[PDB]
RNA sequence: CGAUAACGAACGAGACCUUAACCUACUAAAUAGUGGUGCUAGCAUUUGCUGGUUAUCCACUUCUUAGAGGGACUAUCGGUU
RNA sequence: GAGCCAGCGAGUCUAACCUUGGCCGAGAGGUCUUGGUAAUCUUGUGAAACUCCGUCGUGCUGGGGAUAGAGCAUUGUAAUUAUUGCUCUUCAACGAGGAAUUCCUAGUAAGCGCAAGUCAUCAGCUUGCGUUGAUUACGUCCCUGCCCUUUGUACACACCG
């Protein structure tokens, strides 16, 4: 299935904790700021983290 | 050993492999009113070997009664002329 | 061969002891909105027409 | 100079590269014209795009194709993908986007394979069997 | 003079920094060249059983040795040639030059 | 219509196939409206093709085999029994000859005769197992339209195959006569006999 | 395309060298029906006999058939390459012979009993009815005994 | 590492496995895939007004 | 328009060429024709027994012309094929090098082919002109 | 996901690596190809088509390889929770 | 008879490997040469199945090729209980397989051949490669077994208790 592990979810959680203004709802810019703002040893992992952060930013923007 | 088959005899068909004047004018007058014609049609409906069937197909498409629509090998397809 | 043409509007679920059959809700086309619930062999989903060799039976379940 | 492009069509192992330019309306494949592809039914299969759009779009353009790799039928699919991509490339490069897009719309609405390629790349074989999934046989007694 | 340098190793990044300092040395000295012609990689496969004895499942392992080969063509007079050969000896990579 | 020429000459009949409507070499995929409103949407017309061979990704999803062209499904069913695995070229060859045989006889559209035949030989009610414990029993149920299509094509192909086995009547013509028999409804065709056998056993175990 | 009507010249069966031969079939495979001759030698000797292969067996002439058998019992005279023969460099003469319809089983028994009388391995295997060519005999072939 | 050792009663196998720290690698991956770093953004005192500093 | 073997079809052209050569005088024949199986794998000899040398000749002239340089080895791997090794599974096997050498030497005699350096044979200009010119004659033959 | 006498953790899974696919975007190359020039063969010659040619050179990297890289994260939309 | 298209991969230095070409031989094979330490030459591995034409004819028959007989070559110090190959001849079971049972959900099954491992010679074996390419599901626990929980137990070499 498309479910994701705790490294993804906790990383996404922490980035939205202390970087909510600097990022946004756009998958592309979230990836292109993720690459530098958090050192990640896997490109596929970076993409997964970016996707979940955008999921949570859509949730935050309505409610 | 055991077989699980029966293997009885049959006619051991005597399809012609050469012909005579009776078979010749027979096939000349009887092969029309056969909207579909092929090697197998002549064999099963006229009780002739498949070589005669093929050679007669060449003969009949040369004079012109049977109109081919496909002259592909292993399957020959003819109508009749009208 | 008097048959009945009826259309599945809902699929209830797989039945048979081996998941080999299904339960469906089927609406008669002649005299519409008179429903019935019946069985199917092959793959099927909603809105799907099906011939019935009789109309007046409803097998509930099976093992 | 010349108005010309060079595209391709891939397959299982077959790559068919096609050069297109302004000519006199000729089509060739391995130096042999389009009517000599010779699976003799797949011939119509490779005629299909130009029949869909009509030979009007081939009036003063010459296409020459060269093919390698795999079976006869794989070569055929590679050829038709190559000429479809090359015609759409020619109308991307010099002719207007309207003609290109309606052309490509017809090609895709007929079949996705003429432009996009079959990505079913073959699975390897593993041990334990003759193939990728089929194991040999179990015996107990 | 018409030399050809070639490298025949397996440790990729070693070979690649070798080719890189070679070509930047060559281009800083402003010498003709081709690029690093990267040949097809050759994978040596040895496929055998895991089991020393005969029993267990028939489980096969396939070990591989990946070999990478590169080469460049150069022109330079003999003194700079021999200095270029005696420099850029990085371990793991095997090197050889030929002429004509 | 105008016959347009180019530097490489093309045959004029295929130019005709180009200008009006795509077809076979001869036959017209239109006016093949089927009689069974159940089996429509699980047959495939009004998207014509020249060849009965294409690398359609049909077995990835569930009902993508319904969107496959029906005559392609017939070809795909013909190549089996081991020795004829693969060999789609001989499959489409046998289809070409079979359709020509059907159309020299019964002079309407042989595509029409294959769709009327498959909806004729559709099995409509089947039977299924109930377990029991110690002993198994049956119970008769209804059938999906897609399964009618699949069963009809399987029945027709296998009947023509075993009819063609060990006799002079070639597979093309034996398929054609099986098709026209199933088309009219013959009670002499393998397909119809297996069909009403199954419907009878269903009726019993109703 | 050639069609011609066969009259009483045809015969359903015929005779060649102490062996019945079937008409109503192709001559080359009719010849193969005779023992001591297979498809190769039959086709070869029909070409050397200079006669139609397309024609069947029963509808042939006695001059054709005697010409054929004349070739068959002295082939090397009729310029056959001398490696077609089924007994080349015979043990008793060193000549290249062709054994035929009746002589085949005879000469078979002849060289077999030669091995049997010189007490050779192959001879004793032929005697007991075992396998002679070094086969495995443990597993395969129980349904001959 | 794997080793054999011979006592009078027979052989004893020893094996040793040592996982070093990734961060001290000095060549290769300096980390682990399921380990990531979340660097701190320096918080900023706000504008409090619009204003400009010229060069 | 201009014509070449690649412009004309394959089997009919070889048929027309081999027929032209069988009518065209004295080519060359080995002498062991109507004897041999043309391979090690072919379980029988050919059917057009008086023919089939000319078919082989026409095909090799076409084949060499399409290509640049070939050898009797390449020709054997080309013209042979599957063998039924009885019970044992099929296998590729090479055809009769004597047949291919002899048809090539016949072609060198008539001059269609020409021995070529860097190994092999090659189409001559005489071979080039008469092969292409027979191709021109053949695609107008049907009318 | 959360529920909660449990809190916080570790191994396994996932992550990771290889291989297969995509890149007409970078580095490029007679030990891979492409086009063009000359030399040259054939057919039609009317404009052309099909070829051969490493010392004939000129250019390009789409196909071919490899290096660094990019790309998919279920993106977007609609239901369901 | 013609057409006739792959991919993975292996190769000689103080040795005798892959071997192209041309010449002889029906063929196996021999011969004199060549190229290659390899994207370079073997090799575009011109593979097979396939297609196009004909011959065949429903005939244990041109299906099928065990079984045997004679001869010609190669490998090897040595081939005898035939290494292998080539040629001719002999042409037996086998007419789709009984209770049963195996593998399989996509370029997968299945058909097809190819290289490598073994190797002086010997593939019906294996490991990989590509060529042609389906039908049938998107489910269930009914069979065979697995995982978690609840429950029962006179079980603990643990239900073969």
Residue (of D115, D136, D138, D114) closest to D127 by Cα position? D136
Structure tokens at E39: 């040949």
Contact B56, G4 (CB under 8 A): no
For residues F148 and F138, what is the distance between their CA atoms, to the nearest angstrom?
Answer: 20
Look at residue G137 and give its three-state secondary structure. coil
For residues F14 and F16, what is the distance between their CA atoms, to the nearest angstrom?
Answer: 5
Instruction: Specify the residue for token string 């009809």.
Output: F152
Look at residue E87 and give its three-state secondary structure. coil
Instruction: Specify the residue for token string 């789609």.
Output: F88
Burial code of A41-50, b = ≥16 C-beta within 10 A, e = fewer?
eeeebbebbb
Residue (of E37, E39, E38, E30) closest to E73 by Cα position? E37
Question: Structural domain of residue D119, as residue ranges?
Answer: 1-141
- What does the CA dihedral F32, F36, F37, F38 come to, rounded to 10 degrees? -130
For residues I74 and D85, what is the distance between their CA atoms, to the nearest angstrom?
Answer: 36
Residue (of F150, F181, F151) closest to F163 by Cα position? F181
DSSP chain B: ---S-----------BSS--HHHHHHHHHHSSS-SSB-HHHHHHHH-B-HHHHHHHHHHHHHHTSEEEEE--TT--EEEE--
I103, with CB counted inside 10 A (0-12, 13-18, 19+), is: buried
For residues I126 and H31, what is the distance between their CA atoms, to the nearest angstrom?
Answer: 74
CA B10 to chain CA centroid, nearest Å: 20
Neighbours of D58 (CB within 10 A): 24
Q: What are phi and psi of F116, to 5 degrees?
A: -65, -35
Contact E95, E18 (CB under 8 A): yes
| F contacts of D52 (beta carbons < 8 Å) | 18, 22
Contact E71, E5 (CB under 8 A): yes
Q: Is the CB of I136 under 7 A from strand K?
A: no
Protein residue minimizing CA–C1' distance to J65: E40
Greatest CA separation for chain G = 62
CA I30 to chain CA centroid, nearest Å: 14
Contact D52, F22 (CB under 8 A): yes
Those residues whose C-beta lies under 8 Å from the C-beta of residue B16, and which sit 6 or more positions away, are: B23, B47, B48, B49, B52
| B-to-G residue pairs, Cβ atoms closer than 8 angstroms | 28
Residue C20 exposure: Cα atoms within 13 Å on the Cβ side: 15
Those residues whose C-beta lies under 8 Å from the C-beta of residue I33, and which sit 6 or more positions away, are: I49, I53
| Number of folded domains that form chain C | 1
Contact A5, A45 (CB under 8 A): no
Question: Structural domain of residue C11, as residue ranges?
Answer: 1-63
Burial code of G56-75, b = ≥16 C-beta within 10 A, e = fewer?
bbbbbeeebbebbbebbeeb
Contact F115, F70 (CB under 8 A): yes
Structure tokens at D56: 């009007």
CA-based nearest distance G43→chain I, Å: 9
Structure tokens at D83: 């000429």
Nucleotide with C1' nearest the A49 CA: J73
According to DSSP, the residues that pair with E60 across neighbouring strands are E49
Q: What are phi and psi of D125, to 5 degrees?
A: -105, 145
Nucleotide with C1' nearest the A48 CA: J73
H helix count then E strand count, chain A: 3, 0
| 3-class SS letters over D106-140 | HHHHHCHHHCCCCCCCCCCCCCCECCCCCECCCCC
Contact I47, G43 (CB under 8 A): no
Those residues whose C-beta lies under 8 Å from the C-beta of residue G106, and which sit 6 or more positions away, are: none
Distances (CA, A) of E8 to A6, E11, E19, I29, I120: 44, 10, 11, 55, 35
According to DSSP, the residues that pair with B80 across neighbouring strands are B66
Contact I123, I107 (CB under 8 A): no
DSSP chain F: ------SS---HHHHHHHHS---SSS--SSS---S-TTTTTSS--SS--SSS------SSSSSTTTSS-HHHHHHHHHS-TTTTSS-HHHHHHHHHHHHHHHHHSS-S-HHHHHHHHHHHS---EEEEEE--SSS-EEEEEE--HHHHHHHHHHHHHHHHHHHHTTSSS-HHHHHHHHHHHHHH--SSSHHHHHHHHHHHHHHHT-
Element (H, E) at C12: strand C4-15
Distances (CA, A) of F176 to A12, B48, F27, F78, F186: 65, 23, 16, 13, 14
Those residues whose C-beta lies under 8 Å from the C-beta of residue A15, and which sit 6 or more positions away, are: A23, A34, A37, A38, A49, A53, H38
Residue D76 exposure: Cα atoms within 13 Å on the Cβ side: 22
Element (H, E) at E85: helix E78-86
Contact F142, F171 (CB under 8 A): no
Neighbours of G100 (CB within 10 A): 19
Q: Is the dihedral of CA A15, A19, A21, A23 positive or negative?
A: negative
Method used to solve the structure: cryo-EM
For residues F9 and F14, what is the distance between their CA atoms, to the nearest angstrom?
Answer: 11
Burial code of H4-42, b = ≥16 C-beta within 10 A, e = fewer?
eeeeeeeeeeeeeeeeeeeeeeeeeeeeeeeebebeeee
For residues F63 and B4, what is the distance between their CA atoms, to the nearest angstrom?
Answer: 42
Those residues whose C-beta lies under 8 Å from the C-beta of residue E35, and which sit 6 or more positions away, are: E23, E72
- What does the CA dihedral I132, I133, I137, I139 come to, rounded to 10 degrees? 20
Protein fold of A6-61 = Diphtheria Toxin Repressor; domain 2 (1.10.60)
**Cβ within 8 Å, pair F144-C51:** no
- Strand J, CB < 7 A, residues 72-111 of D: 85, 89
For residues B17 and B52, what is the distance between their CA atoms, to the nearest angstrom?
Answer: 6
Contact G28, G3 (CB under 8 A): no
* Probe site for chain G from I33, I35, I39 (most G CB atoms < 10 A): I35
Task: Indicate the residue of D26, D39, D41 with minimum beta-carbon distance to F7.
Answer: D26
Note whether D27 contacts F: Cβ–Cβ < 8 A. Answer: yes
Distance from the first to the final alpha carbon of chain H: 65
For residues I17 and H41, what is the distance between their CA atoms, to the nearest angstrom?
Answer: 85
For residues D16 and D37, what is the distance between their CA atoms, to the nearest angstrom?
Answer: 13
User: Alpha helix locations (H) across chain I?
Assistant: 11-23, 53-66, 72-79, 97-110, 125-139
From the CA of F110, how many Å to the C1' of K134? Answer: 24
For residues F85 and F79, what is the distance between their CA atoms, to the nearest angstrom?
Answer: 5
Contact I119, I71 (CB under 8 A): yes
Helix F145-164 with F190-204: angle, nearest 10 deg? 130
Residue (of A34, A63, A37) closest to A51 by Cα position? A34
| G contacts of I44 (beta carbons < 8 Å) | 39-40, 43
For residues C54 and F199, what is the distance between their CA atoms, to the nearest angstrom?
Answer: 13
| Number of folded domains that form chain D | 1
| 3-class SS letters over F64-101 | CCCCCCHHHHHHHHHCCCCCCCCCHHHHHHHHHHHHHH
For residues A13 and A57, what is the distance between their CA atoms, to the nearest angstrom?
Answer: 10
Those residues whose C-beta lies under 8 Å from the C-beta of residue G118, and which sit 6 or more positions away, are: none
Note whether D56 contacts F: Cβ–Cβ < 8 A. Answer: yes
Q: Which chains touch B (3 or more CB pairs under 8 A)?
A: F, G
| 3-class SS letters over G21-89 | EECCCEHHHHHHHCCCCCHHHHHHHHHHHCCCCCCECCCCCHHHHHHHHHHHHCCHHHCCCCCCCCECC
CA-based nearest distance B21→chain F, Å: 26
**Cβ within 8 Å, pair I6-D31:** yes
Nucleotide with C1' nearest the D16 CA: J63
Those residues whose C-beta lies under 8 Å from the C-beta of residue F113, and which sit 6 or more positions away, are: F102, F106, F179, F180, F183
Distance from the first to the final alpha carbon of chain I: 18
Residue F8 exposure: Cα atoms within 13 Å on the Cβ side: 22
For residues G42 and G54, what is the distance between their CA atoms, to the nearest angstrom?
Answer: 14
DSSP D57-105: GGSSEEEEEEEESS-HHHHHHHHHHHHHHHHHHHHHHTS-HHHHHHHHH
Look at residue I121 and give its three-state secondary structure. strand
For residues G6 and I8, what is the distance between their CA atoms, to the nearest angstrom?
Answer: 43
Element (H, E) at A6: helix A6-19
Look at residue I102 and give its three-state secondary structure. helix
- What does the CA dihedral A16, A20, A24, A25 come to, rounded to 10 degrees? 50
For residues D102 and I61, what is the distance between their CA atoms, to the nearest angstrom?
Answer: 47
**Cβ within 8 Å, pair F105-B36:** yes
Those residues whose C-beta lies under 8 Å from the C-beta of residue G121, and which sit 6 or more positions away, are: none
Element (H, E) at D44: helix D42-53
Structure tokens at C1: 């061969």
Specify the DSSP class assigned to residue H24: G
**Cβ within 8 Å, pair I7-D32:** yes
PDB resolution in Å? 3.3
Q: Where are the domains of chain E?
A: 1-100
Tally the residues of chain C.
Answer: 63
For residues G78 and G61, what is the distance between their CA atoms, to the nearest angstrom?
Answer: 20
Note whether D54 contacts F: Cβ–Cβ < 8 A. Answer: yes
CA A30 to chain CA centroid, nearest Å: 7
**Cβ within 8 Å, pair F55-D118:** yes
Distances (CA, A) of I44 to G36, G74, I79: 17, 23, 15
Contact A37, A20 (CB under 8 A): no
Distance from the first to the final alpha carbon of chain G: 54
For residues F180 and F102, what is the distance between their CA atoms, to the nearest angstrom?
Answer: 7
Burial code of B9-26, b = ≥16 C-beta within 10 A, e = fewer?
eeeeeebbbbbeeebeee
For residues G61 and I98, what is the distance between their CA atoms, to the nearest angstrom?
Answer: 37
Specify the DSSP class assigned to residue D23: S
For residues G98 and G90, what is the distance between their CA atoms, to the nearest angstrom?
Answer: 10
- The dihedral region occupied by I125, where left means phi > 0, alpha psi between -120 and 50, and beta the remainder, is alpha
Residue (of D26, D3, D2, D24) closest to D89 by Cα position? D3
Residue E99 exposure: Cα atoms within 13 Å on the Cβ side: 8
Chains B and F touch (3+ CB pairs under 8 A): yes
């Amino acid at each position: 299935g498309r479910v994701r592990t705790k490294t993804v979810k906790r990383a996404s959680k922490a980035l939205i904790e202390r970087y909510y203004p600097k990022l946004t709802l756009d998958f592309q810019t979230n990836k292109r700021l993720c690459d530098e703002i958090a050192t990640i040893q896997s490109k596929r992992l970076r993409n997964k983290i970016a996707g979940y952060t955008t999921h949570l930013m859509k949730r935050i923007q309505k409610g | 050993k055991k077989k699980w088959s029966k293997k009885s005899m049959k006619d051991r068909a005597q399809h012609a492999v050469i012909l005579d004047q009776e078979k010749y004018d027979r096939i000349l007058k009887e092969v029309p009113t056969y909207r579909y014609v092929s090697v197998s049609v002549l064999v099963d409906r006229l009780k002739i070997g498949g070589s005669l069937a093929r050679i007669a197909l060449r003969h009949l498409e040369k004079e012109g009664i049977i109109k081919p629509i496909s002259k592909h090998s292993k399957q020959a397809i003819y109508t009749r002329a009208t | 061969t008097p048959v009945t043409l009826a259309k599945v509007i809902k699929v209830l679920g797989r039945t048979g002891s081996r998941g080999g059959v299904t339960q469906v809700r089927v609406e008669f086309l002649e005299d519409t909105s008179r429903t019935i619930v019946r069985n199917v062999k092959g793959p099927v989903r909603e809105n799907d027409i099906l011939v019935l060799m009789e109309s007046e039976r409803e097998a509930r379940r099976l093992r | 100079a010349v108005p010309s492009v060079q595209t391709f069509g891939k397959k299982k192992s077959a790559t068919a590269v096609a050069h297109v330019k302004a000519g006199k309306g000729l089509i060739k494949v391995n130096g042999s014209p389009i009517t000599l592809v010779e699976p003799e039914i797949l011939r119509f299969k490779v005629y299909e795009p130009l029949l869909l759009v009509g030979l009007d779009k081939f009036s003063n353009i010459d296409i020459r194709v060269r093919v390698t790799g795999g079976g006869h039928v794989s070569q055929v699919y590679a050829i038709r993908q190559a000429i479809a991509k090359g015609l759409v490339a020619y109308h991307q490069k010099y002719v207007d986007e309207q003609s290109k897009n309606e052309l490509k719309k017809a090609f895709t609405s007929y079949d996705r394979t003429l432009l996009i390629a079959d990505s079913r790349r073959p699975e390897p074989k593993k041990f334990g069997g003759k193939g990728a999934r089929s194991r040999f046989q179990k015996s107990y007694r | 003079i018409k030399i050809r340098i070639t490298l025949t190793s397996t440790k990729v990044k070693q070979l690649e920094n070798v080719s890189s300092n070679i070509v930047k040395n060559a281009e800083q000295h402003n010498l003709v060249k081709k690029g690093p012609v990267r040949l097809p990689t050759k994978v040596l496969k040895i496929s055998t059983r895991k089991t020393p004895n005969g029993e267990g499942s028939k489980t096969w392992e396939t070990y591989e040795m990946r070999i990478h080969k590169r080469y460049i063509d150069l022109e330079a007079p003999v003194q700079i040639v021999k200095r270029i050969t005696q420099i850029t000896i990085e371990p793991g990579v095997d090197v050889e030059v030929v002429v004509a | 219509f105008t016959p347009v020429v180019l530097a490489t000459p093309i045959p004029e009949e295929v130019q005709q196939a180009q200008t009006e409507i795509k077809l076979f070499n001869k036959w017209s995929f239109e006016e093949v409206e089927v009689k069974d409103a159940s089996l429509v949407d699980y047959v495939q017309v009004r998207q014509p093709i020249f060849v009965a061979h294409t690398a359609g990704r049909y077995a990835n999803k569930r009902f993508r085999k319904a969107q496959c062209p029906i005559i392609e499904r017939l070809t795909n069913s013909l190549m089996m029994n081991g020795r004829n695995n693969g060999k789609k070229l001989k499959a489409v060859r046998i289809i070409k000859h079979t359709l020509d045989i059907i159309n020299v006889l019964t002079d309407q559209n042989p595509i029409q005769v294959v769709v009327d035949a498959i909806t004729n030989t559709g099995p409509r009610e089947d039977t299924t197992r109930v377990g029991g414990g110690g002993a198994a029993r049956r119970q008769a149920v209804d059938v999906s339209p897609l399964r009618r299509v699949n069963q009809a094509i399987a029945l027709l192909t296998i009947g023509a195959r075993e009819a063609a086995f060990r006799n002079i009547k070639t597979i093309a013509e034996t398929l054609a006569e099986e098709l026209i028999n199933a088309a009219k409804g013959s009670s002499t065709s393998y397909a119809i006999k297996k069909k009403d056998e199954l419907e009878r056993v269903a009726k019993s175990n109703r | 395309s050639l069609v011609v009507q066969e009259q009483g010249s045809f015969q359903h069966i015929l005779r060649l060298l102490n062996t019945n031969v079937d008409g109503n079939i192709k001559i080359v495979y009719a010849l193969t029906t005779i023992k001591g001759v297979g498809r190769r030698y039959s086709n070869l000797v029909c070409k050397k006999a200079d006669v139609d292969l397309h024609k069947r067996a029963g509808e042939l002439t006695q001059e054709e058939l005697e010409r054929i058998v004349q070739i068959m019992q002295n082939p090397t005279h009729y310029k056959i390459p001398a490696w077609f023969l089924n007994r080349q460099n015979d043990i008793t003469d060193g000549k290249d012979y062709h054994t035929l319809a009746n002589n085949v089983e005879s000469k078979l028994r002849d060289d077999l009993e030669r091995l049997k009388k010189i007490r050779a391995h192959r001879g004793i295997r032929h005697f007991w009815g075992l396998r002679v060519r070094g086969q495995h005999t443990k597993t395969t072939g129980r349904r001959r005994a | 590492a794997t080793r054999h050792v011979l006592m009078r009663q027979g052989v004893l196998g020893i094996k040793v496995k040592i996982m070093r720290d990734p961060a001290k690698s000095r060549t290769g991956p300096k980390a682990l895939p399921d380990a990531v770093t979340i660097i701190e953004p320096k918080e900023e005192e706000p504008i409090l007004a619009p204003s400009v500093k010229d060069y | 328009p201009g014509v070449s073997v690649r412009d004309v079809a394959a089997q009919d052209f070889i048929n027309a060429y081999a027929s032209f050569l069988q009518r065209q005088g004295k080519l060359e024949v080995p002498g062991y024709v109507d004897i041999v199986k043309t391979s090690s794998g072919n379980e029988m000899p050919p059917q057009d027994a008086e023919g089939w040398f000319y078919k082989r000749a026409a095909s090799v002239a076409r084949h060499i012309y399409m290509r640049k340089q070939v050898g009797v080895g390449k020709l054997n791997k080309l013209y042979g094929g599957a063998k039924s090794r009885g019970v044992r599974p099929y296998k590729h096997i090479d055809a009769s090098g004597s047949i291919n050498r002899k048809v090539l030497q016949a072609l060198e005699k008539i001059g269609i082919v020409e021995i070529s350096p860097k190994g092999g044979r090659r189409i001559s200009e005489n071979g080039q002109r008469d092969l292409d010119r027979i191709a021109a004659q053949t695609l107008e033959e049907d009318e």
